[PDB]
Assembly symmetry: D3
Homo-oligomer: 286 residues x 6
Amino acid sequence: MLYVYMDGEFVPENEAKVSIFDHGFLYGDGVFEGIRAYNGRVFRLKEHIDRLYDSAKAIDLEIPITKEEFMEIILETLRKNNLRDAYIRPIVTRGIGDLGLDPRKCQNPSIIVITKPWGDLYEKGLTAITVAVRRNSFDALPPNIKSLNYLNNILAKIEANAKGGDEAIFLDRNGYVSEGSGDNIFVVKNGAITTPPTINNLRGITREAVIEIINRLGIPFKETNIGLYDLYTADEVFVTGTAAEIAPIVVIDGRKIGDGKPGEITRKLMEEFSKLTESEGVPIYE
Amino acid sequence: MLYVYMDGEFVPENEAKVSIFDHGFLYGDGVFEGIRAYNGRVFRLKEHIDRLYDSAKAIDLEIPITKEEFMEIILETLRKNNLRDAYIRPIVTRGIGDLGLDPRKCQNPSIIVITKPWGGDLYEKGLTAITVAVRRNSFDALPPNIKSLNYLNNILAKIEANAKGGDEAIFLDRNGYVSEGSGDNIFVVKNGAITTPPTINNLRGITREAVIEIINRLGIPFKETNIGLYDLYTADEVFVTGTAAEIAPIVVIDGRKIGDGKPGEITRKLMEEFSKLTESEGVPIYE
Amino acid sequence: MLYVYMDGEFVPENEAKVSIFDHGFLYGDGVFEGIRAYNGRVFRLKEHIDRLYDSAKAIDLEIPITKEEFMEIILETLRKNNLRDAYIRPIVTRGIGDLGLDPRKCQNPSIIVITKPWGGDLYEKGLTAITVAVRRNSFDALPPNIKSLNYLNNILAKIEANAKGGDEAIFLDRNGYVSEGSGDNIFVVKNGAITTPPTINNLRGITREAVIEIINRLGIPFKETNIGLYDLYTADEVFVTGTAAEIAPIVVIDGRKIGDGKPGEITRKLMEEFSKLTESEGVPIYE
Amino acid sequence: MLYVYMDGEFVPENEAKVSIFDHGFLYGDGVFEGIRAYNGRVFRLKEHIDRLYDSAKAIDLEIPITKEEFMEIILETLRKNNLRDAYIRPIVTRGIGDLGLDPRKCQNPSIIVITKPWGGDLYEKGLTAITVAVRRNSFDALPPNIKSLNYLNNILAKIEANAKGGDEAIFLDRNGYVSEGSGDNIFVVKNGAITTPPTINNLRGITREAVIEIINRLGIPFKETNIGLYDLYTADEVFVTGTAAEIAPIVVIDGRKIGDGKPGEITRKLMEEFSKLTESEGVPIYE
Amino acid sequence: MLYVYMDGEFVPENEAKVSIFDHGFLYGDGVFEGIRAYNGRVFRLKEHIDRLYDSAKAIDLEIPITKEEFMEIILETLRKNNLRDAYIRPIVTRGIGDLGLDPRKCQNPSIIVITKPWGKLYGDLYEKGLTAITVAVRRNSFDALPPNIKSLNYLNNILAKIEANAKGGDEAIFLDRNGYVSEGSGDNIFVVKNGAITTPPTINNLRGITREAVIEIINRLGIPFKETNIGLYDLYTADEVFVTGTAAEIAPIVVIDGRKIGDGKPGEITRKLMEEFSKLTESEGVPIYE
Amino acid sequence: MLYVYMDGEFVPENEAKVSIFDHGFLYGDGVFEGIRAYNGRVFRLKEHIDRLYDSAKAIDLEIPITKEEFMEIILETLRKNNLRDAYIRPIVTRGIGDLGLDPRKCQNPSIIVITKPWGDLYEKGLTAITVAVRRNSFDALPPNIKSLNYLNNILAKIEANAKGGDEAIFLDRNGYVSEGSGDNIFVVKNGAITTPPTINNLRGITREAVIEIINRLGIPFKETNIGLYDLYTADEVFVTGTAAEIAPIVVIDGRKIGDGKPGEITRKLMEEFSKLTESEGVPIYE
Ligand SMILES: [Cl-]
Ligand SMILES: [Cl-]
Ligand SMILES: [Cl-]
């Protein structure tokens, strides 16, 4: 029933498989994106594709097709599955080499496009915990690369699962707030909004869209380092990402954030963001 | 011609494939080992299997079979391919789940065993190494003690080495101490004494452990302690250790000749002793 | 019904009060100890008093009496309350001064001795622990070796543990190494060997020292070395040590079962040996 | 003569005492503020009270009264002592609980308000400062943004300054950036522009905020950014800000004259503007 | 043929020598500047002299003459050698003292001015662009040996240069003690991405006079500009990268750690800034002769 | 009339000058040693020469003569000046090159040997202060290299001069005790001695000799990281170096160390070290 684009063919999900000798599998040597289709439009497709190519560049991986070709493949995959509302996961792998680490011995990067249909926690808000693991360092495994190396994020998620949080919050190698395991973080205090610079986290496309809205609404905004203290004493906290959209965080490390309910500024941004997703995007069908 | 063990079946290499929905593929959420078979014996099989289970425990992954069963699967795979001299790569993945990162939605970890025939031009001359700008994954972020499918830190270091004229990359850690090579542990020889970093910022190498046993047996003064760039540059000899590499001499670091620029006497002695050990020890595949 | 020593007078608990202008209250500017009396003997009294004076020296606080006098005051306080089995908390404060933080304006340090009767369930099952996001106070900022009235770092860790389903919090330090629990030192048991962090990033525990003496006496291989999250997660056994806790097994860390998830054999052996030590050693309270 | 508010009653200073079993005393588990009354007005009372509640929130302490009630208690205490010019120190403690550090066993937080009369030589000449070896408490360990009873880090810095010939201590943070003085925020003036550290590694000073408002009103170029030792040493002018200090010029740092070694023109201008602000703003105590 | 100013006298290059007991030699205890003369004008002379005095202040060294006197000595040295296009290296040392490191035993700081003829034999020498590598050594810390001080302690820079020589780069790029991009071994670094320019704050590197001039041009041209921390990722994924310094002017970086930067050629924004900077150096400066 | 060896000639001190174009002067690009002659013997000459060559190797500088030749030049210089009790400062520079920092343009390293005669604070002990500047990092400008880059040490000394200490004590980039501005540090507590590992400081020749004495006397000894706390609460503290020998530290940051007088263990080591210097060394004359 659902087809996956895999190296020039459409393949049913149950048969969508990659060689175990692909370095993307052996070493997580590959890059991916997360993209949303709303009402027959692909939201910020070009921005996501730009980031995919940036991720590839960072790991010295040449994507064997052009950005225009990649965009067409994504639209084609959504068409083949007749989707209007979907989550899209393009993946590019290093390809097959030998059992060592050398990426120069790898031939034929795989191009994969997964599309899955998209059909309670946002009325109540999420509980978050700060994890003991620091975010992968920007001088070790830069988190700005959306790569198949996501075990740092998974360890944080495992901590959150064990420790009663819906979401994990990372600090970075220098003690600053970084992001959630799968999303950027914003703090609201006295009508002003702050978010960490992007060096220690990922340059979120949702984060960028939300900042555009914040500026359009004239809410005072600063991109600056934040600490545990700012999280705990915030009027409101929310996280942003493709899958999450804008998710309110109402408890952090057992402490109620403000009144413990999604805040007024968060709710306003949720509305404005919904509007943006309904009116922007590359059309799938004509 | 070569078969891979994949979840209870032997599958030809060309067909050995994993679902793209396995979290091992999507997120590198899985663990692996590198094991060597020499002359029909599997060198330190039990030690590698112990480490595999430790790696799995560190990432909260339950391996669905026992260690004894895992050892039997490895031996069976070597038998099916009629190998006596091989490299073995067991892999355990988190398994198929949804497209989020939550490992709770994953069911059925995959168990994979790759065996490839493994039959020293760079070892007579020694290797050139470069120190990389990327630090090793932190022991408080993505602990390098876990041999996981997250190897992009190692690959970035290797990319730097390829671009910068080194056969091998050397990492420093988040605190500025020498960690290891991109795929092996590092030892420094100075005035007849040997030092190696503690294992917290690198990986508890099985070769490293075997080499330390030899060092102690030979009565060479040995210390496990932090090392710096200075110690690398001014060493009498440097070598790296791992399953694939065995003992590889490093004769140039960052453009500087190490000692006389040839593999050193202590390194050569350890290479001989290690060869001897691989020829006389191990779990028999056939016998 | 209990008397507290307070600056030369014995005072009922309900009246044991300190001026709000004491810098020990305003700024946590003071030091303390935790000492145990077992069966009419005070366990390691001299070691605790030495550490109290070391803590005071570290914060440039002169304790206005001698160590011998301090020991006599402690024994007297236990006598006055007729205790044989107790927890003792000596406290020395900077003393009353002005509203600024300058300790030079403080005159007369207060000397306080609290003694409370000691009359487990969590020790048969073992404790659950979580690693906290807050790092331990740095050894170059507010050295954790000082047992001072500044315990908010420990309290924040405890608050995290309370919210996150742990009985105990485990700290990492400013450099990413394992430090200690919020109120106790940490030991890791792996393949019959024991490791514990060096004391620089934590506190030189008197229980920790006693336990190391036992470990050496029993010939269990022991190393004082840096430990990481990986070592915690993959340990055969983990336990914590302190005056109040004695030896407490840790059986779950961050949702991961430690070994079999029950107090381990080595831990149980050390618990027995430590019990024996407390029953046979100490400064007698009554003659 | 002077009364202290303590849990619903006015108590003479000499009798203002807290139980030694209060966690605010045992562990510095509590929060405080420093507020100034000028000419019958309380300067920035609401801002200080907001920060007090933020400090409490950061340490998960529930202040048992509302902010309005707290403001009334402060004004009442100033009235009872007939003060027009005073320093006010509200304190909230975790309260009496057990001898362990667990804050869940604490039940009734104490509310304390100290008011002391206020009544220049060092401000005409300026202060000498030294940079200390101790780093500021980390924003990921014991966040300095919390104005808590844990002030030993500040006291250690002050002890260093006392011993090393400075009127004031300057901290760097865990990452090597300038943080603040032991009891005040720091500003640097260079080529007519002013810089101050972001507030993450120090405290969000109410004086600092007021001074930034003045700076902006006067159109002096201003940047909140990280500063280093170099910026201190080569500054045209340096000054510190806090409730007690107001604006204090720093004219020597680590033996080096700052600019001409006298309070600078920009500093003097800000001192005048700040004086004006304190004379015309505030919550009236009486009228 | 070339004279060096040395403590009040002009001395031929071959005889320009300092006592081995000068702490400037023994311990690198001294400060220096790098200044350019273009077409009879000294570019940003006053800015360089201000930085020289700031460097001296940072190491608690009192320069025994005034800034005006120092400027006159520099112009005099250029005059004596009849230069119009030159590189100028003023140096101030702590002076002769005993063999311990205590600077209190030093008396009489030396003042040295070197001037060497400089200038392009070929206009487009940066037509292809430079290759760079990121080094393993971190930049001297701003809490250890602050890189803002242009001192005679340049071994950190030399180690990075040694790494670059061995590793196939024309230039070395440093990260700092906290993992952020700092600068090249002898120049400030700028990154261009989607028409916007970023550069590290100056705390972990040096407040470059070229960097300041380039920022003025960037602002005048209305290119979006931000001073903020940058990482390896930003270098690798940049549209363009360039470095700035007195000797280098504006040098395009077209390869970093084996990765082509954008199209692997000097970029449009870089080329535009190179032109604008050339114009600035042709029309500004303290006249040597006039 | 003291002579300095300079590239093959003995030159009077007042004329001992180096070209300002030598990179050793321009960039501190060179290495040095500090060696002591006692009663006609050069103490640990071979150890110092080994370290000099190690320093040179660390900065990729080829010393143009052999170690045996270097030792002869040192002895010759002491002979020419008729010294029996002296401080020797051999220096090797990168040499003259262009005005850039590239060491490849530098072709002829200078060899310099300074010898100066050596002829109250030890009875009373020294005051020390801990400095704000951290020691040059072992991953930036490794302090194990005894190079002409000594401004880190000088900044610490400037702090000590201004702050009332005879000596400055450094912490390292990771917060551990490193060393004094010109000497290694040892801490004595409950009859046991500790000293930092050598990675963050310099492998002192005096430090090595003192450790040999400590072992010979059977004093418990451990090489391990030390903190501010260990300094402040020590029974005794002392520093070691060629010029200082063994110097007691009796006050640190305003705190009396033990009783505020040189300790028993320190005094014992001072005696044992004196004995060692009187009975060991390469003879200058026959
Ligand atoms: Cl990392
Ligand atoms: Cl801290
Ligand atoms: Cl450094």
